[PDB]
């Protein structure tokens, strides 16, 4: 019943952060946020220039080695382990692999109770706040947009073309068992 | 004739920034670009305070003393000589002064040719967004969201409420004589 | 006999985000990094104006309240499973509570091989480094450079007074066992 | 005899920033600080990537083009008209052509009152802080640790190789006439 954990889907600027800083404050019990990011930022520098780490191509193209994959793993077990502890945590993701990626999360997340998110957004609207924000390889923003979510299962879907990061969170929140 | 400067008022939050990196990407020469917040950035630390420098209150206020104002001018003046040196320049500012601000401004401007542009947004979206971003002392939207355009003269005026960044650059950039 | 985490522990700009890049960077296999800083990027925003929270006094003073410790509680079980999953785990924490703090860490970790580091700098060194660094409450460093060491026991101990952060990785390293 | 701006030069990593904070907290009067950091960060993300602008190569190579230099100028003209309309200027800079270099910015200084630092530290230990800070590409410390200073003249000269910055600040304070 209780929500334990909350997981973001979506492409790259399609206001995904925004969303969580966003539910964070909505939510009544404290809510840790962890992500593809902060997972980056915690993974040693060289891994974005490793063979098997993570390459981010000049053209805003992502590829994902083993090493980086092992990694994620462990990380991602953590992170459930980390729930199952009683700490509620809301996670931002990419599922690059659509399907797989989420299948991938299933795996490790096991019985545990989850709420799954999808934030969709078009890609050229993307696109712009991609260049809006400065920070981001001209890109990805358009590369991510669909693909992300072809196969993909959501309990609750949001849309930020139109809506505000604010907005996407109560939509979410309402869906929170507590 | 030609555009020697551009610019832009508005309320925290507003999306001031994201237009301006959205105009550097899209006007064809180079445009440099400075704001209030670049200036704080470049005082002082011990500017943020003292009793004439500025302050930020707890809920949002933001108080300007006459040590800051003082290193303001300086500060406007020359941006206004890079200009007068053939560099094109965006200014992004909160006219918390209202009017009163932007006569300061047209006062070190001289004959120099000006895009003056505004930049609204509803105080409910902007207080928002302030949430959204994580990064901004709550309270400082909401308070600016009006106030800011009182008695104000633009050459162009732009709602971030429902258009992206990219849209507003688009709107602005053809109002720039090259 | 092989290392599954290093924790170290040492009072603000002792210099131990340098040294964790710098173990990323030496050390051959990749090690994940997380430290007190990290957890509150990922706490809620609020939990720094919240009772039971961390409330940062003007003077330096750091608070953490039970609501601040719970959370923290399962995070670094999270963090415990993340090694025992696989993943090499850097942890920077700063033990404000001495000894107390390292019991409560030995408390989650269990027999996990872990390698304890100290990293020591004199009071006033570590002030000038705060206010080199621009990012920080003056008053933090002074007030951690002793306290947070008393009655803790290590198995490597760096001083940063006269030591570089590069040179007291190369010391932490040689105790790794791969 | 009032000094009126202070231009510090050294390779990057040098510890220049440091520093740089170091005398705003040091100087009684407020001293506004810019550099070729905040240059870059003003400049139009493009110009990154642009044949005339900016070019990070690599192996921590910098390429400067004439639409890079011809910006600079004009922004070199402002920053020295901000300081002969009464404001304090610090200036950060990494002189890549050595003398050359400085004698550009003699060249836009004029009769202006301006003291000249250089900051020095060794290749090696540069290059050791340089992986510390994870926030530059691996290789610029050591090739500009001293090609930067040949030929160039200064009024005061620091070392942070073994100097904190808050002690080269003090060094610098006192060369500094009110
Ligand atoms: N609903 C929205 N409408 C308009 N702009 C938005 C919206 N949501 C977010 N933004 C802004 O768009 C930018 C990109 O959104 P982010 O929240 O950073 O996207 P993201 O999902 O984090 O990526 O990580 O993947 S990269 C940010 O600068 C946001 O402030
Ligand atoms: N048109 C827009 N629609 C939705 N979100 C936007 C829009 N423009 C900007 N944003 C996002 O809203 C946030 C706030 O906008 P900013 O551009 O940072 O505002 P601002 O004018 O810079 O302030 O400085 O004053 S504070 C950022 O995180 C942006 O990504
Ligand atoms: N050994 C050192 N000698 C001189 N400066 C250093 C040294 N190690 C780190 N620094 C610098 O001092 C500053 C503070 O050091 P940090 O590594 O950020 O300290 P810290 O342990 O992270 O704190 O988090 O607690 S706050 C940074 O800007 C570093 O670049
Ligand atoms: N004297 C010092 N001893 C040890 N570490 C230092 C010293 N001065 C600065 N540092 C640290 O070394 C790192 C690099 O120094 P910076 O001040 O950032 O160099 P820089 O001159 O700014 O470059 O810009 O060019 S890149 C920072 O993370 C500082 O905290
Ligand atoms: O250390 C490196 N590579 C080897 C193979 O040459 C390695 O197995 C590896 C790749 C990425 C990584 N990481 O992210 O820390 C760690 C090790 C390169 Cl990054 Cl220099
Ligand atoms: O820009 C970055 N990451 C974006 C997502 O924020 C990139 O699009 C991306 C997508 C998926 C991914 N993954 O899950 O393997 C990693 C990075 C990091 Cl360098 Cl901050
Ligand atoms: O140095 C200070 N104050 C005096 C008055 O006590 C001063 O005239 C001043 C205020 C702000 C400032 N700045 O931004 O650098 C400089 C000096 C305080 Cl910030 Cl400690
Ligand atoms: O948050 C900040 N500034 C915002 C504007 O970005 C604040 O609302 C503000 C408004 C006006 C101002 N001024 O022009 O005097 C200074 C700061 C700085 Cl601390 Cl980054
Ligand atoms: O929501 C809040 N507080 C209550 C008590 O009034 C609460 O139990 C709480 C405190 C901190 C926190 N966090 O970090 O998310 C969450 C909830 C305040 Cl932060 Cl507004
Ligand atoms: O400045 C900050 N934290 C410093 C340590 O980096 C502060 O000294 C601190 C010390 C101990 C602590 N804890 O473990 O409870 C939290 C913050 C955060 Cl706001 Cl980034
Ligand atoms: O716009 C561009 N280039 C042309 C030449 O193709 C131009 O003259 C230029 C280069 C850099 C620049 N900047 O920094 O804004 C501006 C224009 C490229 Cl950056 Cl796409
Ligand atoms: O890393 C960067 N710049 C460093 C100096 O901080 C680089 O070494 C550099 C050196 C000289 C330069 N210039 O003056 O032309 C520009 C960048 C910027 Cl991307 Cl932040
Ligand atoms: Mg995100
Ligand atoms: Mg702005
Ligand atoms: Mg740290
Ligand atoms: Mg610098």
């Known amino acids: 019943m209780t929500t334990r954990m909350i997981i973001l889907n979506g492409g790259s600027s399609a206001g995904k952060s925004g969303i969580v800083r966003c539910l ?20 040693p520098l060289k891994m974005q220039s490793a063979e098997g780490g993570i390459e981010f191509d000049a053209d805003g193209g992502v590829s994902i080695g083993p090493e980086f994959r092992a990694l994620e793993g462990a990380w991602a077990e953590g992170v459930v382990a980390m729930a199952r502890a009683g700490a509620r945590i809301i996670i931002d993701d990419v599922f690059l692999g659509g399907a797989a990626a989420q299948e991938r999360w299933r795996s490790f997340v096991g019985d545990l109770d989850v709420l799954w998110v999808g934030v969709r957004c078009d890609g050229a609207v993307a696109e712009g706040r991609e260049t809006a924000r400065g920070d981001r390889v001209a890109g990805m923003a358009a590369k991510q947009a669909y693909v992300v979510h072809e196969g993909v299962e959501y309990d609750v879907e949001v849309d930020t073309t139109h809506k505000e990061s604010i907005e996407c969170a109560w939509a979410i929140a309402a869906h929170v068992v507590p």
């Open 24 to 43: 964070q404050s909505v939510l009544p019990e404290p809510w840790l946020a962890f992500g593809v990011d902060s997972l980056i930022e915690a993974m």
